[PDB]
Amino acid sequence: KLPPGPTPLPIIGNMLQIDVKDICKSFTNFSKVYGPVFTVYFGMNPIVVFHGYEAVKEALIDNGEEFSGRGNSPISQRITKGLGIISSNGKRWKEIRRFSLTTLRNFGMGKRSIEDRVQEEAHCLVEELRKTKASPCDPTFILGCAPCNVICSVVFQKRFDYKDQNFLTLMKRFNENFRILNSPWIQVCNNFPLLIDCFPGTHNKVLKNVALTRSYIREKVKEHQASLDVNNPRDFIDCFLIKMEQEKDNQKSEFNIENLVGTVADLFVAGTETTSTTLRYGLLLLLKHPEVTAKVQEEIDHVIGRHRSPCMQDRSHMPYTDAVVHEIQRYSDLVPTGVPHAVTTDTKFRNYLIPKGTTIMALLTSVLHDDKEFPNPNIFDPGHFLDKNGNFKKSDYFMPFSAGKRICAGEGLARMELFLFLTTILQNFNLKSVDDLKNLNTTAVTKGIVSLPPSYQICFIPV
Numbered sequence: 001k002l003p004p005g006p007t008p009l010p011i012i013g014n015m016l017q018i019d020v021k022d023i024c025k026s027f028t029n030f031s032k033v034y035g036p037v038f039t040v041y042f043g044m045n046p047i048v049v050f051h052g053y054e055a056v057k058e059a060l061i062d063n064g065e066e067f068s069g070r071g072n073s074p075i076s077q078r079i080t081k082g083l084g085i086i087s088s089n090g091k092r093w094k095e096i097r098r099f100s101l102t103t104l105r106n107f108g109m110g111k112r113s114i115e116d117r118v119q120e121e122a123h124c125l126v127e128e129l130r131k132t133k134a135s136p137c138d139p140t141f142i143l144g145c146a147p148c149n150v151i152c153s154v155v156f157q158k159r160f161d162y163k164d165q166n167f168l169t170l171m172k173r174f175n176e177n178f179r180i181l182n183s184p185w186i187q188v189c190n191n192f193p194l195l196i197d198c199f200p201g202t203h204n205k206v207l208k209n210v211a212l213t214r215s216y217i218r219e220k221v222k223e224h225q226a227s228l229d230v231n232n233p234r235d236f237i238d239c240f241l242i243k244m245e246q247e248k249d250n251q252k253s254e255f256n257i258e259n260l261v262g263t264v265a266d267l268f269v270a271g272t273e274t275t276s277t278t279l280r281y282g283l284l285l286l287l288k289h290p291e292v293t294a295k296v297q298e299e300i301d302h303v304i305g306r307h308r309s310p311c312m313q314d315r316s317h318m319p320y321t322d323a324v325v326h327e328i329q330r331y332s333d334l335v336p337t338g339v340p341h342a343v344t345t346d347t348k349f350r351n352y353l354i355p356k357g358t359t360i361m362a363l364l365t366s367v368l369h370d371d372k373e374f375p376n377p378n379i380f381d382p383g384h385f386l387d388k389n390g391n392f393k394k395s396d397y398f399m400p401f402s403a404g405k406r407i408c409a410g411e412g413l414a415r416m417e418l419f420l421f422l423t424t425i426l427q428n429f430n431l432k433s434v435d436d437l438k439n440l441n442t443t444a445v446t447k448g449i450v451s452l453p454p455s456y457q458i459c460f461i462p463v
């Protein structure tokens with residue numbers, strides 16, 4: 001008894017009724033014809049889509065457990081092999097996530113807090129930006145090296161030097177796979193597996209980058225083993241190695257060198273491109289909206305000054321900069337469809353029964369753009385996260401990190417990098433448009449699962 005929906009054609013399903021590019025605009029129109037919940041078939045596979053705050057919440061939150069499964073697929077499977085945190089499910093997930101969540105706490109990796117790794121990075125970033133010499137440029141590459149280096153710093157103790165070859169290769173690697181896997185073709189090939197054979201070259205490249213990466217990590221993990229100081233862990237690998245030590249006897253324990261190379265890999269994948277995107281998107285918005293930046297720089301001056309580096313602690317005294325960072329995520333809507341889930345067993349959702357394994361889809365964007373909770377949801381405006389007094393106004397509708405039992409495993413780190421990197425930049429630079437702001441477009445290109453901001457150029461003018 002799946003929820004209603006467009007009756008499918010045989011063999012293909014509703015495919016030709018869904019714009020594979022902006023598949024969310026497609027879903028939104030379906031909702032106006034079948035309501036909050038509904039089923040669509042990609043190929044022979046059913047997919048029950050949830051639209052609106054109440055549907056997404058009732059599902060993800062209220063029925064948390066049953067909706068905490070990761071919808072998987074032919075591609076996702078052959079890349080990860082069910083290893084790691086993102087793609088795993090059941091027992092192996094719960095144990096890896098729980099270990100990951102606590103090991104990723106501000107101090108969960110030893111004497112050196114993560115904030116300190118982020119703050120040091122926000123530094124090198126500002127230094128690289130000075131190198132542009134105020135000249136117009138595409139911030140994409142520079143902005144990407146920071147979030148990627150933060151992860152390096154979190155899993156490999158030390159951060160790389162931007163010119164270091166290993167870092168550049170480590171990046172291209174992940175970027176290439178990011179671009180491949182973000183093609184509308186992925187949605188097709190995932191449902192019509194046979195069509196993967198039609199992409200020999202691309203198939204090999206993806207697997208090759210994945211293969212090479214695993215090697216590098218493993219080579220790097222041995223370095224950690226042969227130098228492990230059990231009493232004070234250096235990074236993420238140390239913590240895992242220590243945990244592995246304890247389970248030494250349990251032959252069915254998840255903590256083995258295999259999930260370690262996996263979970264590490266996942267960390268880059270899960271926190272590099274997403275952060276980089278929101279960052280690049282955030283600057284574009286601060287550029288397009290000058291009267292906004294001015295206020296943020298005003299808080300920065302008033303609460304941090306030119307006297308020192310911003311730290312997470314200032315955020316409690318900077319309501320506006322907080323509203324901005326919240327509105328940047330709400331507006332830029334990084335993952336409109338959220339990441340596909342799957343119900344854990346036969347699940348009951350008001351009048352409907354959803355078979356175990358079915359693919360779920362909680363449309364985050366439908367929440368982030370609720371027109372009642374956010375009047376004029378399509379205009380970037382910090383007011384959305386501000387009360388009549390200029391005080392921060394938290395929202396239950398703020399789900400860019402998703403919700404429920406499978407909410408972003410690195411939200412904190414994510415929120416920390418956005419606030420640090422963004423305030424640290426605005427402190428040392430002012431944003432200048434190569435052209436006229438009016439000629440500046442801020443509409444995303446959703447030719448894929450990860451919405452992207454339009455390409456642009458900017459001039460970092462040292463204050």
Ligand code: HEM
Nearest residue numbers: 085086270271274275278339401402406408409410413414
């Ligand atoms: C701009 C920043 C980021 C955003 C908006 C974002 C958001 C997301 C979203 C929407 C999900 C899927 C949640 C679901 O299952 O429904 C996710 C999960 C995940 N994120 Fe992020 N992310 C970002 C950065 C980070 C960072 C910096 C890390 C690194 C620690 C991280 C690691 C993860 C991991 C490991 C998962 C998979 C969790 C699981 O399946 O149990 N994320 N993220």
Ligand SMILES: CC(C)(O)c1ccccc1CC[C@@H](SCC1(CC(=O)O)CC1)c1cccc(/C=C/c2ccc3ccc(Cl)cc3n2)c1
Nearest residue numbers: 073075076086087173174177181209210213265269270274
């Ligand atoms: C990548 C992204 C968008 O930043 C992200 C961030 C946080 C959480 C999820 C995601 C989506 C990652 C999704 S891509 C899903 C797709 C559809 C499907 O197969 O079901 C679009 C193909 C995903 C889910 C589970 C595991 C993975 C593992 C990826 C991975 C694993 C190891 C890798 C080693 C080297 C390289 Cl160069 C790339 C590697 N990539 C990816």
Ligand SMILES: CCCCCCCCCCCCCCCC(=O)O
Nearest residue numbers: 075078079183185189199202203206
């Ligand atoms: C083991 C993992 C295999 C993954 C195979 C993924 C196959 C899908 C390849 C899609 C390639 C799309 C290339 C077109 C790029 C473009 O010009 O838009």
